[PDB]
């Protein structure tokens, strides 16, 4: 029982339910209420269902009977029903035992969309057997299903499997408890700070902590095997393992690693500070949230001219924020078949839930929630359904398990007015065209790792480029790099030819000022004046 | 001799080390893991495009490790009798555990784990549940490790990916230039070559081949040599003379020919039709020709200098000008001369009547392009697929708007963005969206103007390069006389 | 034949394919011709039927895998190759693709000679004019 | 019949076609009339349903293939000739496409005579007038 951790309330409830009808039923008869027999367990996979059931079986010592879900069938004519009947008969006749059915969904699919007469038979036989619940038997049933919705509702009826226990994702304290429990047999170095590791394992749930520990041990073992009793996993080893791993549930939607720092995003200082405050304060000052009593905003929409850096800010948030992040592309959600689209949106938002904190970055929102003006004309006839599903799943998120969805569109005019309403996505950040100081900051942030000649005055370039967007600055820098590379290649070719018949190791060690001067002859503003006018008009209107 | 040793796999040293560690250390040095205290992972999932070496890795592990090895083909588990597949799985797992500490290899598990929520088969859902229970549960495993191989990991059931069931997922992906050299040296250590052969040039000139593709290249080269020397020697079913049978040798011309024929298996579905153009075939346009040539050849041939300066290269380019000036001709020249792979797609080719399949096609094309990178993608008449958003009152569910949004996200988004070159060719760029025209997607806007007198003379010389002519005839008068003509004229 | 292998029982199409390949390999160095593979290989990604996915995976594994093939060459014919799973269009499974396309004038003349060698003909008939005037005939 | 063959099961419709053709060929040199092929042959390019593609492929393999046909002829009927897979319209499977269209007024007179001969009518009615009058009425 002590082995299972992080589930204090649920474990106490299960312990009471399993012990009171099994330890002393005299008090149960005295009070008169008969405690239930069937017990269901629900929650994400790996939360601790099987571990908890085995711990209850050991701590109690009652006789046990495991019914493997898919292992109830047989080859000979009519043996599954007899198998289940004899299992329950032996469980009752032997002692006040406990019967545990693993993966109940494998046996009790449903009574509607369920073909296979043999299956239906087995389902009805199990329903009847659980119906015949005699308290004198003193046997309780423990059910453990990772799919609580796709269960035959008849089994939920009173008299059989009546008490559910939603064993949900462990919290910070539960994560610390699990880390301490798992790290006790391992020889951890002195410098390890399990409290810090648990405060940092934001989205990890259950098995993920064990995975982190195992990975850290493996990394340390290789680190000292390549180079006996002097063996200990250090804090840097555990940090490396945590960085390598990702939360188990969100494994499928794991985005590829693109690096970006908060100093890489030149300019937009106040906007980045506000975004950091908005994303970190609700996650770091829960005492402040409780004292204020005001629900934090659960959405944000960046709008502005193209290339201003919306995707760059989103990448920076995904990299620097200490929470999970799932990127979504506009048309990516749409699907050919009927229903698949809304099913995929629901699956995405469900995955975003159960792993809080999370940050769903919806890029190019003009594809998911566009202004569905045309309705008389018949087409796909599903865009409205998708928009309604997104609205219901953005307005329906509970206050607990804060999941902030960041939207990003280039033309907000096509975004439907509905999604831009209070509650669903309130804050609207506008990313304007960079000013001279912002342009200098962007250029210095983009040329951080580029070796440059000592006498380069980027301030002149910034002062000259006045209506140029960040993409224009990137183009200028890339053109300068290309011209310098061409000059270096020509010099190296000449030197190689001469030696075959002379520059230094680097014929062009640094990008020449003349190189940038010639590169800037072919630069122009990316966004025109009509687009700038339309964006300014939208900003002032809203 | 035919047994594949652990050295046969090439280009995947990191994954090889990871799998070797997981398979050997808990058996060669159990004491180390008892000293550290916890048990090691006991589950590995290999994933990547086909023809990369996952099954080769399984063969290597089976050959090298002296422990018991049990093999499970994917659909092989299924059977006709009701509830018999689960019995087969139980029999397999019990035999594996009972006999010895063992390695099970479960090939193509993708077909057996249909995610249990989109699937509707009863026998299938019971096989998934039986797998889950055998893999994890009361008395889950005892000194048994499971390796699985898949091509589409996103189809696997989420419950199977959690720690405890499949702890490590290794990505057996496309090799790099050094990987291609290692693969070539691996595959050519047994076949006898002519000393003039240069494997480094071949590895450099191969751009997207993975494993079996390189093997195909080698095989085809050998066959070309056999059909180069089996001509002088008669059929002679009874015997082939020793003088020819030995001293065959495989010249570099055979390798060049086989490289000129073969293309990466991934791109086999979108292989462009053969066309014969050359750079001298394009008259005029000298500066644009050299600019394009250098802008394509520099990132692929000189990566060290780009990494020295620590800046990414330019990717996109847009030709625009009056019709009949040589845009498609330049694209053909790039396709035939430049080393990078070519995917030529027309403007309205990718659209479809169904809902979302236009953007699905776009995503598939760009996924293939970045998969077999470096590649050049030619978008002819960009004003067909990339129009301004919100122009049309009546529309088919805003399909064009979703298409342009998908293009925007695929050309610039949350992707690795290693090396894909987008070339656009439209003669009316006014319909092109400003987002597309923004730098970072299509940054170089090249105008292809009408030829002047010397360019018209150059074009005429280019177009008359394969025609016999009157020696007395001169073209200078014709050039002096045409002043507004085009190349088509 | 293409759809000859499919059966109603669950796990029988793959059994038929396994039996076929085992028979082919157990006897001698054999040749396997599979006609109309476009019905068996529905790309295993656009299709939604589980039995189709399972059959495609069975064929892929039987064709390539551990101890994959021992001196048996497999021939396939299709009218549309683009609608086939890319995993089958790889070296080791289908090494080389020959394109049997539209014949030219010489090919049409050859076909005419082949098809008019057992039937009786008059002396006024010349085949060269017929092959010249015949333009888009597929043979 | 057109739709009678195809079934919901996996690989049963193909069995229906195989059973029909095998029974015919084993029976005797025979004629096989298929009605409403447009329901069986959706061209394999606009037919999302995979059972349709398998049915078309099985039919193609039955008519065409190794020793496909022997002393048995086939006749087809479709209101919409265009709605059919192009591979079927090739020689060897469906060589000649004959149109049974609207007859001429003389054909109308023939039809009237054939209908009229069994039934009994007054002597005043003359068929020639009625036939000339009815121009578009067919069959």
């Amino acid at each position: 029982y002590d082995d299972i951790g992080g589930c204090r309330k649920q474990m106490a409830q299960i312990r009471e339910m399993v012990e009171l009808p099994l330890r002393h039923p005299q008090l149960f008869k005295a009070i008169g209420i008969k405690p239930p027999r069937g017990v269901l367990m629900y929650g994400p996979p790996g939360t601790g269902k099987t571990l908890m059931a085995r711990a209850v079986a050991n701590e109690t010592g009652a006789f046990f009977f495991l019914i493997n879900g898919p292992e109830v069938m047989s080859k000979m004519a009519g043996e599954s029903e007899s198998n289940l009947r004899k299992a329950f008969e032996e469980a009752e006749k032997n002692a006040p035992a406990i019967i545990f059915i693993d993966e109940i969904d494998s046996i009790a699919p449903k009574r509607d969309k369920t073909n296979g007469e043999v299956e239906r038979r087995v389902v009805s036989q199990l329903l009847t057997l659980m119906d015949g619940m005699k308290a004198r038997s003193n046997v309780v049933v423990i059910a453990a299903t990772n799919r609580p919705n796709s269960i035959d509702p008849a089994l939920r009826r009173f008299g059989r499997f009546d008490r559910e226990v939603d064993i949900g994702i462990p919290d910070a304290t539960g994560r610390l408890e699990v880390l301490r429990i798992h790290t006790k047999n391992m020889k951890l170095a002195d410098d390890v700070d399990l409290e810090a590791l648990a405060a940092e394992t934001h989205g990890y749930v259950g098995a993920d902590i064990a995975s982190l520990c195992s990975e850290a041990a493996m990394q340390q073992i290789r680190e000292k095997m390549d180079l006996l009793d002097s063996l200990g996993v250090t804090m840097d080893n555990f940090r490396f393992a945590l960085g390598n791993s990702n939360p188990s549930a969100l494994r499928e939607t794991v985005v590829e690693s693109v690096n970006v720092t908060w100093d890489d995003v030149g300019g937009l200082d106040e906007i980045k500070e506000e975004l950091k405050e908005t994303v970190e304060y609700p996650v770091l000052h829960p005492d402040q949230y409780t004292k204020f009593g005001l629900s934090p905003s659960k959405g944000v929409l960046f709008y502005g001219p193209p290339g201003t850096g919306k995707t760059l800010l989103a990448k920076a948030v995904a990299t620097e924020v200490s929470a999970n992040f799932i990127s979504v592309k506009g048309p990516e959600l749409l699907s050919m078949w009927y229903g698949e689209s809304e099913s995929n949106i629901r699956d995405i938002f469900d995955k975003a839930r159960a792993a809080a904190p999370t940050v769903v970055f919806l890029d190019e929102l003009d594809s998911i929630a566009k202004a569905r003006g045309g309705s008389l004309g018949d087409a796909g006839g599903a865009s409205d359904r998708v928009v309604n599903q997104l609205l219901t799943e953005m307005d329906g998120m509970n206050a607990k398990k804060n999941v902030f969805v960041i939207g990003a569109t280039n033309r907000p005019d096509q975004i439907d007015p509905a999604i831009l309403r209070p509650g669903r996505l309130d804050q609207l950040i506008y990313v304007p065209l960079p000013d001279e100081n912002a342009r200098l900051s962007i250029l210095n942030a983009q040329l951080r790792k580029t070796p440059l000649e000592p006498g380069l005055e980027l301030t002149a370039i910034a002062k000259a480029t006045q209506g140029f967007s960040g993409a224009d600055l990137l183009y200028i820098v890339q053109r300068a790099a290309k011209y310098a590379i061409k000059d270096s290649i020509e010099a190296h070719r000449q030197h190689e030819a001469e030696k075959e018949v002379e520059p230094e190791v680097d014929p062009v060690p640094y990008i020449t000022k003349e190189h940038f001067a010639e590169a800037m002859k072919t630069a122009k503003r990316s966004v025109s004046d009509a687009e700038l006018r339309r964006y300014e008009a939208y900003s002032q209107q809203m | 001799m035919n047994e594949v040793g652990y050295d046969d796999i090439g280009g995947c040293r990191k994954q090889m080390a990871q799998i070797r560690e997981m398979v050997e250390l808990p058996l060669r040095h159990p004491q180390l893991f008892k000293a550290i205290g916890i048990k090691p992972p006991r589950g590995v999932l290999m994933y990547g495009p086909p023809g990369t070496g996952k099954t080769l890795m399984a063969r290597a592990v089976a050959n090298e490790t002296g422990a018991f090895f049990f093999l499970i083909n994917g659909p092989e588990v299924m059977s006709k009798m009701a509830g018999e597949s689960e019995s087969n799985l139980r029999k397999a797992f019990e035999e594996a555990e009972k006999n010895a500490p063992a390695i099970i290899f479960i090939d193509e598990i993708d077909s057996i784990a249909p995610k249990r929520d989109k699937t509707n088969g009863e026998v299938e859902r019971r096989v998934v549940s039986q797998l889950l229970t055998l893999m994890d549960g009361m008395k889950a495993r005892s000194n048994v490790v499971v390796i699985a191989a898949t091509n589409r990991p996103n189809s696997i059931d989420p419950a199977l990916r959690r720690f405890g069931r499949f702890d490590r997922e290794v990505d057996i992906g496309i090799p790099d230039a050094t990987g291609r050299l290692e693969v070539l040296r691996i595959h050519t250590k047994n076949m006898k070559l002519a000393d003039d052969v240069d494997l480094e040039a071949l590895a450099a000139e191969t751009h997207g081949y993975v494993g079996a593709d390189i093997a195909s290249l080698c095989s085809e080269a050998a066959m070309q040599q056999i059909r180069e020397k089996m001509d002088l020697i008669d059929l002679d079913e009874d015997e082939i003379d020793a003088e020819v049978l030995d001293s065959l040798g495989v010249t570099m011309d055979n390798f060049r020919f086989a490289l000129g024929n073969s293309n990466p298996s991934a791109l086999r579905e979108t292989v462009v039709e053969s066309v014969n153009v050359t750079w001298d075939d394009v008259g005029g346009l000298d500066e644009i020709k050299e600019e394009l040539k250098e802008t394509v050849e520099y990132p692929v041939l000189h990566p060290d200098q780009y990494t020295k300066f620590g800046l990414s290269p330019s990717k996109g380019v847009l030709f625009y000008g009056p019709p009949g000036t040589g845009k498609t001709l330049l694209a053909k020249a790039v396709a035939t001369e430049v080393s990078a792979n070519f995917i030529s797609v027309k403007g309205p080719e990718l659209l479809s009547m169904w809902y979302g399949e236009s953007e699905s096609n776009i995503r598939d094309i760009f996924d293939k392009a970045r998969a077999a990178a470096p590649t050049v993608v030619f978008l002819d008449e960009l004003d067909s697929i990339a129009k301004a958003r919100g122009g049309s009152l009546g529309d088919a569910g805003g399909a064009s708007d979703r298409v342009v949004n998908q293009l925007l996200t695929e050309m610039d988004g949350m992707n690795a963005k290693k090396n894909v070159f987008v070339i656009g060719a439209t003669n009316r760029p006014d319909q092109i969206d400003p987002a597309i025209l923004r730098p970072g997607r299509l940054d170089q806007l090249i105008y292809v103007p009408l030829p002047d007198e010397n360019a018209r003379l150059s074009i005429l010389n280019a177009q008359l390069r394969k025609t016999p002519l009157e020696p007395g005839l001169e073209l200078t008068a014709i050039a002096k006389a045409t002043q507004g003509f085009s190349g088509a004229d | 034949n293409g759809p000859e292998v499919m059966s109603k029982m669950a796990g029988e199409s793959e059994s038929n394919l396994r039996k076929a390949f085992e028979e082919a390999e157990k006897n001698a160095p054999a040749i396997i011709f599979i006609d109309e593979i476009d019905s068996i290989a529905p790309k295993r990604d656009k299709t939604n039927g589980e039995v189709e996915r399972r059959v495609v995976s069975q064929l892929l594994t039987l064709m390539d895998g551990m101890k994959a093939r021992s001196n048996v060459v497999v021939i396939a014919a299709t009218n549309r190759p683009n609608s086939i799973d890319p995993a089958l269009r790889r070296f080791g499974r289908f090494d080389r693709e020959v394109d049997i396309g539209i014949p030219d004038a010489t090919g049409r003349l050859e076909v005419l000679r082949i098809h008019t060698k057992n039937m009786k003909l008059a002396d006024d008939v010349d085949l060269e004019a017929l092959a010249a005037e015949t333009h888009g005939y597929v043979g | 019949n057109g739709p009678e063959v195809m079934s919901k099961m996996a690989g049963e419709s193909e069995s229906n076609l195989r059973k029909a053709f095998e029974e015919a060929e084993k029976n005797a040199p025979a004629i096989i009339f298929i009605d409403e092929i447009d329901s069986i042959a959706p061209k394999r390019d606009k037919t999302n349903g995979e059972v349709e593609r398998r049915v078309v492929s099985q039919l193609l393999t039955l008519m065409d293939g190794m020793k496909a046909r022997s002393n048995v002829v086939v006749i087809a009927a479709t209101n919409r000739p265009n709605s059919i897979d192009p591979a079927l319209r090739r020689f060897g499977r469906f060589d000649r496409e004959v149109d049974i269209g609207i007859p001429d007024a003389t054909g109308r007179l023939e039809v009237l005579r054939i209908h009229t001969k069994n039934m009994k009518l007054a002597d005043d009615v003359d068929l020639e007038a009625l036939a000339a009058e009815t121009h578009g009425y067919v069959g």
């Binding site: 004519a77 | 006709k80 009798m81 088919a396 | 796990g11 589980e50 | -």
Partner: peptide
């Protein structure tokens, strides 16, 4: 002895259509 059976029936699709506006 009883036995199971494998059967895949159909699905649904949602096409799109382009109109003409006066």
């Amino acid at each position: 002895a009883a036995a199971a059976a494998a059967a895949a029936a159909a699905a649904a699709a949602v096409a799109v259509a382009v109109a003409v506006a006066a």
